Write a protein that binds this ligand. Structure first.
Ligand SMILES: O=P(O)(O)OC[C@H]1O[C@](O)(COP(=O)(O)O)[C@@H](O)[C@@H]1O
Ligand SMILES: [Ca+2]
Ligand SMILES: [Ca+2]
Ligand SMILES: [Cl-]
Ligand SMILES: [Mg+2]
Ligand SMILES: [Mg+2]
Length: 321
């Protein structure tokens, strides 16, 4: 402990994944998510930590379970901060599609950036390009710098990015630069980790995705010794000026209340403040990062990726009876 808890945390994501898996292909993203949230909370509440949910399902008002500030754990052990994404890929789960997974990160008290559930522009790279990125520079400059750091031509650089209307221009810009663009339907947490996975052609993740998702990515990227910058963006500034403005202003007032500057570049250490992070993710369906659950009779299998910032990276293939 806390290294002794690594296995306990993997059981939490295995439970969440198996619970979400029950709703795979059932066309109900809310119910799938609720099942995974419930299973994750049940399991966390049997772990010997004094956990606070810092990234989660919503404020107490909108989220009955795993709400921001919720206390979880038996209360024995260390005060830790907890980031949960019980299903990354809820729509993908509802639709029986690839790349759904259950995600948890655990760190020292105060180790995760406290920021609103708003959008964040992200630029994420692996260890081979650590120190070569700066979101204050033009995208094309960053991409050139990263390719040079990795010792490959620009035309071979592979950038992953969410396939969303907000990204039309930048995707076209990158393709014109001659880079390879892997535009993904959802799931920038899992995709961010591919930057640190040698057998994935992905070199960089770039683009606007969920802020809490970006803070989880910062935690795991830090643990893997990659690099990331983020920049918080208000809703109307990413979707267009229309109730976006209303949502946007709540977000900016929240940034101030939490003492965060929106639109300012966040360095890796601004989002994940220490190396003492345990990250666990378990596949629901097969994706680029993890195998999916299988079931034959009364036996089910899961694969879990378990990463500890202090230290080896583990892939745990379990058979459950
Ligand atoms: O769908 P949006 O509004 O582009 O939000 C992007 C965020 O949603 C995700 O793609 C997850 O999708 P789901 O919410 O369906 O689970 C994240 O990986 C990402 O950060
Ligand atoms: Ca959720
Ligand atoms: Ca999410
Ligand atoms: Cl969009
Ligand atoms: Mg969405
Ligand atoms: Mg890779």
């Amino acid at each position: 402990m806390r290294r002794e808890l690594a296995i306990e945390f993997s059981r939490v994501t295995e439970s969440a994944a198996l619970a979400g898996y029950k709703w795979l292909g059932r066309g109900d993203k809310n119910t799938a998510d609720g099942a995974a949230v419930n299973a994750m909370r049940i399991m966390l509440n049997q772990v010997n930590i004094d956990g606070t949910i810092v990234i989660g399902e919503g404020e107490i008002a909108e989220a009955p379970m795993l709400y921001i500030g919720e206390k979880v754990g038996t209360g024995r052990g260390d005060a830790v901060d907890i980031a949960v994404d019980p299903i990354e890929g809820t729509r993908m789960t509802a639709m029986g599609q690839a790349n759904a997974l259950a995600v948890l990160a655990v760190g020292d008290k105060g180790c995760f950036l406290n920021a609103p559930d708003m959008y964040m522009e992200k630029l994420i790279v692996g260890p081979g390009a650590k120190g070569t990125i700066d979101l204050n520079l033009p995208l094309a400059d960053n991409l050139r710098n990263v390719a040079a750091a990795l010792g490959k031509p620009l035309s071979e650089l592979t950038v992953t990015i969410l396939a969303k209307p907000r990204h039309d221009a930048v995707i076209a810009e990158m393709q014109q630069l001659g880079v390879r663009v892997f535009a993904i339907p959802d799931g920038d947490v899992a995709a961010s980790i591919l930057t640190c996975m040698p057998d994935s052609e992905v070199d960089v993740l770039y683009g606007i995705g969920g802020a809490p998702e970006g803070v989880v990515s910062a935690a795991v990227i830090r643990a893997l010794d990659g690099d990331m910058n983020g920049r918080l963006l208000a809703r109307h500034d990413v979707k267009g000026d229309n109730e976006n403005r209303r949502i946007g202003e709540q977000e900016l007032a929240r940034c101030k209340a939490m003492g965060i500057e929106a639109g300012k570049v966040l360095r890796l250490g601004d989002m994940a403040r220490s190396d003492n992070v345990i990250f666990s993710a378990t596949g629901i369906t097969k994706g680029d990062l993890l195998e999916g659950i299988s079931r034959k009779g009364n036996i089910a299998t899961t694969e879990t990726l378990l990463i500890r910032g202090k230290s080896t990276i583990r892939r745990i293939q379990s058979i459950h009876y």
